[PDB]
Amino acid sequence: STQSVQTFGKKKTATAVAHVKAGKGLIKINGSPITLVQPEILRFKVYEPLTLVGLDKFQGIDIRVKVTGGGHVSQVYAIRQAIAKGLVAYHQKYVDEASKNELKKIFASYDKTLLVADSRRMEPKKFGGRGARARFQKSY
């Protein structure tokens, strides 16, 4: 076929599936350029995996991700993880892994959540209260 690897990024429930193709450096979120992801005060969270290593690595590859589940903020952490995970997974398979190990060091030294999925999920609710730990007000 072509130079293809496929990966995914996760948050609480949000999951972003990354398709990594060979190309001109096309980077889209659900068919839209990453320059227009509405969580804007947070647009640099997905710009971080790009500008840390340098945009020149993305000359030959184009990335299209599909993010579903979670919420608006939860989707950004899932997306930035799927792209970062995709670049490393592409390097291990179509370039020497020495460069792949180079990319893996900077991502982890800056933010672990770029490559490693965050394990926090919501605690179940227990009866006798409206929340996981909160309880109904007691009266004597």
Partner: peptide, 9 residues
Amino acid sequence: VSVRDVPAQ
């Protein structure tokens, strides 16, 4: 140019 390439707002 597509619809997805323009800000929604």
